[PDB]
Amino acid sequence: VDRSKDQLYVGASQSSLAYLDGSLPGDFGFDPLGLLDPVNSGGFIEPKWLQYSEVIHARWAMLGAAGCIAPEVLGAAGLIPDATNIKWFESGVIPPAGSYNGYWADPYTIFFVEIVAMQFAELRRLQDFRYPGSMGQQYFLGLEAIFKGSGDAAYPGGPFFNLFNLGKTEAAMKELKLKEIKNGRLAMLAMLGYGAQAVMTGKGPFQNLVEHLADPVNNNILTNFAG
């Protein structure tokens, strides 16, 4: 894949350019397996779902990439107590890798709150994709006024999801969508980096950066195969 910015990335093919016309944000013509071809598409392999899913992954990954390294950075700076300076994979998400005791409840009590909270947030978001505008109709404590959407599932907008109504013009909004997707793709690769480096090294992402800078030649993936 061609990094940075380019008219087309390395993997672009004449076949992919038939349907990748540049309208979608981040359309650099990179679809070697042809997953976005509209002809005879169905199921979840279709342009709308796949584009919607990429944005969803991008936004979760951006939260994850910042959240999986923030406690270590702030812990190094001394802004938070050392007790909460923990590696992302030792916070209790994977108890075998380590867990933090000190939350106001055990992680299974917390997890039930997550299920109920995410079911509401996720299933309502699903209904706007399946039935556009349907979340603004039924009574939801007066909050249905901000769940109308815009006809494009990935960009609901509205008085809350677009709180400061940024990107007022079409050119401005198009520019912002490109920035959202490129930061999102960068974050998605960063999360993959965090996972692989945790398995390879057993240390946090911030330690890996510090050690690579200390001695780049002797600290890298090639020297991490051995021990």
Binding site: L8, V10, G11, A12, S13, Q14, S15
Partner: protein, 86 residues
């Protein structure tokens, strides 16, 4: 010190040779299949990957010859040890 060792030299040489052979018409590529007589001939490519290389060398050629080079190199490296040369 792995770098500069006999194993490192063989692997670099084998992968470089396969990449060089394909790029200079000495091996089959994406745009050149081979007939029953072992002669290169223009092929029909479904995807039509785009490349700015003057010879039409695509990324698929890099993966194909990279994999072929590693197979060639690994066989030689393990082969030389088997006979005791390396």
């Amino acid at each position: 010190g792995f770098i500069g060792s006999s194993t490192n030299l063989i692997m670099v040489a084998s992968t470089t040779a396969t990449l060089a052979a394909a790029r200079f018409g000495l091996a089959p590529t994406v745009k050149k299949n081979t007939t029953a007589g072992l002669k290169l001939v223009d092929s029909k490519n479904s995807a039509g990957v785009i490349s700015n290389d003057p010879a039409g060398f695509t990324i698929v050629d890099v993966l194909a010859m990279g994999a072929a080079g590693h197979g060639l190199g690994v066989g030689i490296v393990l082969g030389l040890k088997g006979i005791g040369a390396l």
